[PDB]
Ligand binder design. Structure first.
Ligand SMILES: O=C(O)CNC(=O)c1ncccc1O
Ligand SMILES: [Fe+3]
Length: 199
């Protein structure tokens, strides 16, 4: 899509370390399946690291310094996360990107992410950096309207997408995860999305 940059296998050499750091983050702020304000439990399990974390609070979504499950700050952003995000963001031409939030998604087979926009960040000029690890997933994206036609791209282990420019506000999602196996993740896919969430 216009504005979006795909860097295939950009995070391949870093994957092992990133996965260790995911485990470390989740040991402090555990993965949970958040409940939408619609009352549905998501198939995707989530957690956050960094100064701010995306979560549900009082039947709604927000960036918060505190993990509502633990009542403690989200774990600090791992070095591996920060390094890889910056190498990706710079390669795609976003030198001033300074992320302070990393949402971590975990997909078991069957798990999917419904069509949505990321429009909750203060500056929409800032991109989102997205890192795929483990099992491959079909990423779908449309446009500015919920009913716009979808295009599909397979995202694989180590792929990084820098989601900026025109595509920044496009609706997008993930199709039900095909069952499979990966040496590093076992039977799941992880996705990291780095954001400038602070005002
Ligand atoms: O790949 C996922 O599991 C979900 N990714 C996203 O929701 C996303 N959002 C904004 C920009 C890039 C993304 O990959
Ligand atoms: Fe998204």
């Amino acid at each position: 899509a216009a504005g979006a940059v795909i860097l295939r296998r950009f995070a391949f050499n870093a994957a092992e370390q990133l996965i260790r750091d995911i485990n470390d983050v989740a040991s402090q702020s555990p993965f949970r399946q958040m409940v939408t304000p619609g009352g549905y439990t998501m198939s995707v399990a989530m957690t956050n690291c960094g100064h701010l974390g995306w979560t549900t609070h009082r039947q709604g979504y927000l960036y918060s310094p505190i993990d509502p499950q633990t009542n403690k700050p989200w774990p600090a952003m791992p070095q591996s996360f920060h390094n890889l995000c910056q190498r990706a963001a710079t390669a795609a031409g976003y030198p001033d990107f300074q992320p302070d939030a990393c949402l971590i998604n975990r997909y078991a087979p069957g798990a999917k992410l419904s069509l949505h926009q990321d429009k909750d960040e203060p500056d929409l000029r800032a991109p989102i950096v997205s890192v795929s690890l483990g099992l491959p997933a079909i990423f779908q994206f449309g446009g500015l309207k919920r009913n716009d036609p979808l295009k599909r791209l397979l995202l694989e282990h180590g792929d990084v997408v820098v989601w900026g420019g025109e595509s920044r506000l496009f609706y997008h999602g993930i199709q039900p995860l095909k069952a499979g196996f990966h040496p590093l993740t076992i039977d799941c896919r992880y996705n990291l999305t780095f954001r400038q969430a602070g005002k």
